[PDB]
Design a protein around this motif. Sequence first.
Motif, short mmCIF file in Angstrom:
data_model
loop_
_atom_site.label_atom_id
_atom_site.label_comp_id
_atom_site.label_asym_id
_atom_site.label_seq_id
_atom_site.Cartn_x
_atom_site.Cartn_y
_atom_site.Cartn_z
N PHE A 1 38.57 49.73 54.29
CA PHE A 1 38.43 48.45 53.60
C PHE A 1 37.88 48.64 52.19
O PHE A 1 37.06 49.52 51.96
N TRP A 2 38.29 47.76 51.27
CA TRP A 2 37.76 47.69 49.91
C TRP A 2 37.17 46.30 49.70
O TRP A 2 37.72 45.30 50.17
N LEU A 3 36.03 46.25 49.00
CA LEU A 3 35.30 45.00 48.78
C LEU A 3 34.82 44.92 47.34
O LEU A 3 34.06 45.78 46.89
N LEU A 4 35.18 43.83 46.67
CA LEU A 4 34.56 43.51 45.39
C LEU A 4 33.07 43.21 45.60
O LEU A 4 32.63 42.93 46.71
N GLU A 5 32.28 43.30 44.53
CA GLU A 5 30.87 42.95 44.64
C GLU A 5 30.71 41.51 45.11
O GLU A 5 31.41 40.61 44.64
N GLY A 6 29.76 41.29 46.03
CA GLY A 6 29.47 39.96 46.56
C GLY A 6 30.22 39.60 47.83
O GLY A 6 29.91 38.57 48.45
N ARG A 7 31.20 40.40 48.24
CA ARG A 7 32.03 40.04 49.38
C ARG A 7 31.40 40.58 50.65
O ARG A 7 30.74 41.62 50.65
N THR A 8 31.61 39.85 51.75
CA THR A 8 31.25 40.27 53.09
C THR A 8 32.51 40.38 53.93
O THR A 8 33.39 39.52 53.84
N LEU A 9 32.62 41.45 54.74
CA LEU A 9 33.64 41.55 55.78
C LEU A 9 32.97 41.66 57.14
O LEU A 9 32.00 42.41 57.29
#
Length: 190
Positions: free
Chosen positions: A177-185
């Motif tokens: 998974f890849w996440l921008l800053e501030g994101r929750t998965l």
Amino acid sequence: APVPSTVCPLRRKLWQNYRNLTFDPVSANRHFYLSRQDQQVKHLRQSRGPGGPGSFELWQVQCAQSFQAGHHYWEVRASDHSVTLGVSYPQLPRSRLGPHTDNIGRGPSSWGLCVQEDSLQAWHNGEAQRLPGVSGRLLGMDLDLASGCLTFYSLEPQTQPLYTFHALFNQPLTPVFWLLEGRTLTLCHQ
């Protein structure tokens, strides 16, 4: 506490192969904070020092589970757009050699679906297909390793397939998974 609703019969069929996933903390980018027994991850602004060897320099984290034959399905909830959901062979690079922060589907060893503000991108081998955007943030991945098919779903408001890749998978696949800053998965369990 997911809100009760009658489960779509197609979604219930997908759940016959449901797998409960957890994140791998050794892989996690140093800015990532894991919680809920490693079922949830958030990309924070503040770093946790050097995460250590094996940690993604990219804004990425992988799961502790891998898949090699059979048929497997799981669901993930994103807090917002600007996340990528995918699978990779073991050779996926951890380093950020350039300006890009997401390498999922940017080579022959991984496949991914990136959710953007107003579109989706289905990535493999450095090529993206641009697809119409979706508002739903509950996403499914159906991995049929008997037939070699990987299908991404949106589950809200309906069960809707978004894109299918076909491949003759020749190594175990690990969710990544890849996440921008501030994101929750959140890896959903059933």
